[PDB]
Design a protein around this ligand. Sequence first.
Ligand SMILES: O=C(c1cccc(O)c1)c1ccc(O)cc1O
Length: 208
Amino acid sequence: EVETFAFQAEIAQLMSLIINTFYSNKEIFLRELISNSSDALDKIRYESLTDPSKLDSGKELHINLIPNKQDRTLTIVDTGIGMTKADLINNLGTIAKSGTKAFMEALQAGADISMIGQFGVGFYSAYLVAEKVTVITKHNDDEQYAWESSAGGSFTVRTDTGEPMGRGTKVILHLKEDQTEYLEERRIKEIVKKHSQFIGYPITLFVE
Ligand SMILES: O=C(c1cccc(O)c1)c1ccc(O)cc1O
């Protein structure tokens, strides 16, 4: 059973802007997704301080970067708080409508697409490099779900029966044909070192 949802008009507009605007500095997508994973890991860390049982679903707090050249996917995995079905539908736990407005207002005042994260809608920078994004998530208070969107105004949500992950979020980027440099080990290393060198969690770049 797959449920299909319309993106709110502002998010559809934001995604269209990310996909259609000429902007060469696409590598910032990885900084934005690692930043989101870091935020999710801080959240479960903070909740665990008063309720250590919240780590029964996994004590390790980390971020894994998984390139797959055969599938042309770059997956960002974290063992953060995860998202409920409600969080997923509500723009992946973001204030995407007000955030999109503030980002638009910022762009008019001299900002560029790299500042997207400041407005809490950094997730959508995934569409700088991906034609489709799949989000597999598991929060302690809910079931495992898969969110997916190829943009075009809609997203789907379904239960995810395969590969139980325990807790956290997996962001699967189905890369555009001309964005395969983000599958290269030296390119991923370079971006992590440039933009995410002081993240407070281990970032493991998997090899093939
Ligand atoms: O699961 C989250 C998340 C992030 C911040 C707060 C929260 O309640 C959930 C998440 C959201 C986006 C992403 O790219 C990675 C993630 O782990």
